[PDB]
Amino acid sequence: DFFRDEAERIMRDSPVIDGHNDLPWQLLDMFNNRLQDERANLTTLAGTHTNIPKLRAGFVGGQFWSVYTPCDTQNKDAVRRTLEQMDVVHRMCRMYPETFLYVTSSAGIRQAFREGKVASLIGVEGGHSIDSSLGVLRALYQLGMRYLTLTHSCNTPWADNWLVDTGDSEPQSQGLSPFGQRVVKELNRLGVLIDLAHVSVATMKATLQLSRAPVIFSHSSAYSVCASRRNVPDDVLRLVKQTDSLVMVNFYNNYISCTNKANLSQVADHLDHIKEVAGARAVGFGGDFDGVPRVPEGLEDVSKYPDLIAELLRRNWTEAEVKGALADNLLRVFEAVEQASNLTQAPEEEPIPLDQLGGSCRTHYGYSS
Amino acid sequence: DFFRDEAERIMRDSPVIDGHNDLPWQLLDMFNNRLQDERANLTTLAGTHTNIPKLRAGFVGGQFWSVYTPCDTQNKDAVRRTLEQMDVVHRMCRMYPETFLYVTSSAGIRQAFREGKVASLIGVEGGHSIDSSLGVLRALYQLGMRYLTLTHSCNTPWADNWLVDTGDSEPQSQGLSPFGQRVVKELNRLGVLIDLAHVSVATMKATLQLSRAPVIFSHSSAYSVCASRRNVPDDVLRLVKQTDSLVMVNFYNNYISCTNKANLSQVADHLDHIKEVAGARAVGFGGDFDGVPRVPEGLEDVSKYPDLIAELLRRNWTEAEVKGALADNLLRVFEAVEQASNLTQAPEEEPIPLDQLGGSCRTHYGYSS
Ligand SMILES: *[C@@H]1O[C@H](CO)[C@@H](O)[C@H](O)[C@H]1NC(C)=O
Ligand SMILES: *[C@@H]1O[C@H](CO)[C@@H](O)[C@H](O)[C@H]1NC(C)=O
Ligand SMILES: *[C@@H]1O[C@H](CO)[C@@H](O)[C@H](O)[C@H]1NC(C)=O
Ligand SMILES: *[C@@H]1O[C@H](CO)[C@@H](O)[C@H](O)[C@H]1NC(C)=O
Ligand SMILES: [Zn+2]
Ligand SMILES: [Zn+2]
Ligand SMILES: [Zn+2]
Ligand SMILES: [Zn+2]
């Protein structure tokens, strides 16, 4: 097919930079992070949407590996598990240096491309990973964190999640609390991409107005095509365009077709909508592979990407528009976030108020007057 | 005084490298780590044993800043707080660049020396910080940890603390558990100094026997001069001699005189003993300033180091013997730890048995039990 052949042509020069893959979660749940276990060899790994040959076959040259710890680890062992999940990614890149190239910069991604290696970055999914600490946040940054999904499927003491918009979770901060604002301010100062996937609409809006740099939705689709609260509504998409942000499309069937069954065409519909409402420089991929149970027909795994690009081409997307959805838009936003960073600027050090910290798993040293 | 003048002469070419200062804990306790607070200004900080003017007058050119979180944080927020405390050390060095030089290697200490700066390293005190995780261990390593105090004054699930020897604690591992042995094995491959302060005699022997590299007692004194179980007995001192380890003397009164009152001459007594039994290369300093409530008359703060050196010259110690206690012995041990590390070797990944993980502040993903 001409279009599939064209997809591959463009992809050899502009590999796909995906914004959210939950393989590290699989490595933990399946092998307790024991990478030397034989069933855990990534060149032969089966039962997952991802593995080395599939990444190569799908022309994936950059991946934000999701460092994820469930919501029930908040106020428990969220910080410890986050560090473990960051460790497995560090190790994965050392065990397979011929494949993965661990990076923490926009320039690093371009280097991986040059070397024919899959750029591997870390994306921390959920604000509960920092346990309301600016110091943990700075520690994660040093450990490689390059994007922080403010929340996951649960409220933090300083940011509300999407379940607030479905009625399941009660609005706590109604967007960002004053400490949440300092978190956002610290993220900008550090040069960490602010990810708005999983947050409530109030938080999306609060952060888009507040953030000094372009934000992202690492794995979110269009609310107009599928009315999921995990999806981005049109008024927000207009904020996305206004700020020159980025929305990285999620392939999960239930966010694509709003039902269990979905296909490659419906995913292209989401990409088309975002492209008209938010503009072409606001579209990207954040498949959510290995994080979701159901993936689209035609988009079974990480090797199916070229087929999705062929469809875009079939639909008359220009080469510039697809290359932008492939890697360029992410690189634009990443560079912006880096240019907006100011490390010589005094870090945020005002802790969250004690009355806002939660759980029965902490001590109160430092707090007094 | 002739001796005081010679001390200052020797100290210019051999600044003291102290193995344990709890200033970080004071910054937490007094200001909640708010370094921008003017009360917290280190050039005029009062009410502590340490500050910039005092560090300069004591001829200190190397400092292992203790990153300590109380035993009651174990199975709670030990990891969070460990990161916060490591964060304060990082910022402190960034905030006072003229004084502090954050280093993580032996050549770094030597450079801090050439540049006239106080080499700042991180020593994590207490195994509860890694929360029985090899992953958290490696995370802490990347964040700056150059020595791990196996335990503080409480047992971890893999090592026994000194309170076992006084009858206050029950010997759980009776040395090092199999997991505890891998922690040691992992510490050897990473190049992290194993600190035996606060551990039980059994743990001291198990580690001295097991470790492929010399160890340290960052802040422990002679048991013979003061029968405190925070002090090292002569049998272990013979082991320190064979393995070429190092004991950095604690200045605390109740460890020096074995009572609330103590003076500079009694500290020199412990140094004399250790130099006799363990050898002149098994001796150093780990004052424990800002960590304990009582310090010797003549050693009220960190500026008093030249006075102790003068007393040693008084007691006929050779220049080389004092140069070694000042900086040379720690440096020898550190480089021996770096040469024994195998970064190329595969990281330890066999987790601690689930049944060995205590507390009700965690989740069991990875095990599923
Ligand atoms: C993974 O398996 C392949 C073939 O089955 C082998 O060539 C490779 O050495 C293995 N890699 C690791 C890290 O075990
Ligand atoms: C495809 O885009 C080109 C842009 O030059 C346009 O001329 C053409 O009409 C488009 N194709 C269709 C079927 O609209
Ligand atoms: C600390 O205070 C002194 C004067 O007391 C001032 O000169 C210096 O700039 C201050 N340093 C910082 C880091 O605030
Ligand atoms: C003092 O130490 C020196 C080494 O410099 C040694 O030769 C001498 O015997 C010692 N003198 C006394 C009185 O112990
Ligand atoms: Zn998600
Ligand atoms: Zn995810
Ligand atoms: Zn201590
Ligand atoms: Zn201490």
Swiss-Prot record, chains A, B:
| The entry's keywords | Cell membrane, Cell projection, Dipeptidase, Disulfide bond, Glycoprotein, GPI-anchor, Hydrolase, Lipid metabolism, Lipoprotein, Membrane, Metal-binding, Metalloprotease, Protease, Signal, Zinc
Query: What does the cofactor section's free text say about binding?
Result: Binds 2 Zn(2+) ion per monomer.
What effect on the protein does mutating R230H have, as reported in its record? In a colorectal cancer sample; somatic mutation
Tell me what happens on changing E125D: Abolished dipeptidase activity. Does not affect ability to bind neutrophils
Impact upon substituting E125Q: Partial loss of activity
How does the record say this protein sits in the membrane? Lipid-anchor; GPI-anchor
Q: How is its activity regulated?
A: Inhibited by L-penicillamine. Beta-lactamase activity is inhibited by cilastatin.
Q: What is the effect of changing E125A?
A: Loss of zinc binding
Reaction(s) catalyzed by this protein?
Answer: an L-aminoacyl-L-amino acid + H2O = 2 an L-alpha-amino acid; leukotriene D4 + H2O = leukotriene E4 + glycine; a beta-lactam + H2O = a substituted beta-amino acid; L-cystine-bis-glycine + 2 H2O = L-cystine + 2 glycine
Instruction: Report any one BP term from Gene Ontology.
Output: neutrophil chemotaxis
Q: Where does substrate bind?
A: H152, R230, D288
Lipidated positions per record (GPI-anchor amidated serine): S369
Q: Where in the cell is it found?
A: Apical cell membrane; Cell projection, Microvillus membrane
Q: Which EC number applies?
A: 3.4.13.19, 3.5.2.6
Upon changing E125C, the result is: Complete loss of activity
- State which tissues express it: Expressed in lung and kidneys.
* Main localization category: membrane
User: According to the UniProt record, which cysteines are disulfide-bonded?
Assistant: C71-C154, C226-C258
Subunit structure and binding partners:
Homodimer; disulfide-linked.
User: What is the similarity comment for this entry?
Assistant: Belongs to the metallo-dependent hydrolases superfamily. Peptidase M19 family.
Q: What is the protein's name according to its record? A: Dipeptidase 1
Organism per entry: Homo sapiens
Lineage start: Eukaryota, Metazoa, Chordata, Craniata, Vertebrata
